[PDB]
């Protein structure tokens, strides 16, 4: 399936993109310059993208968003912890 392959690949990449931001905050224990607003609103939007994926029945949309949400929450947690 061409569509899902591309979808999984897009989602593998956008979700994993969050890992370097997480690791950086963790390694340096600082996130002063990181925008909390961005991740706050990203989280809600991403939760809506999840719902959307469920309605149109598309697994790559579903998966990428659930997992990004976990990773985004880490980032939010470290922004608050190292503040």
Ligand X SMILES: CCCCCCCC/C=C\CCCCCCCC(=O)OC[C@H](O)CO
Of 30 and 63, nearer to ligand X (C-beta) is 63
Point out which span in 3-11, 32-40, 44-52, 66-74 binds ligand X (CB under 6 A).
66-74
Cβ-defined contacts of 23-31 (< 8 Å, 24+): 25/75, 25/78, 25/79, 25/82, 26/78, 29/82, 30/82, 31/75, 31/78, 31/79, 31/82, 31/83
Where does this chain touch ligand X (CB under 6 A) — which range of 4-12, 24-32, 38-46, 67-75? Answer: 67-75
30 binds a copy of itself (CB under 8 A): yes
Determine if 34 is a binding residue for ligand X (CB under 6 A). Answer: no
Q: Are 47 and 61 in contact (CB under 8 A)?
A: no
d(CA 46, CA 83): 24
| Interaction site with a copy of itself (CB under 8 A) | 2-3, 6-7, 9-21, 23-25, 28, 30-35, 37-42, 44-46, 48-49, 51-52, 55-56, 58, 60-61
């Amino acid at each position: 399936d061409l569509n899902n392959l591309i979808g999984i690949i897009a989602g593998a990449i956008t979700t994993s993109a969050l890992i370097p931001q997480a690791l950086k905050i963790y390694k340096t224990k600082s996130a002063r310059d990181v925008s909390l607003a961005m991740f706050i609103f990203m989280a809600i939007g991403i939760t809506l993208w999840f719902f959307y994926g469920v309605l149109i029945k598309e697994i790559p949309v579903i998966l990428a968003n659930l997992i990004s949400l976990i990773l985004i929450f880490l980032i939010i947690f470290m922004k608050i912890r190292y503040g």
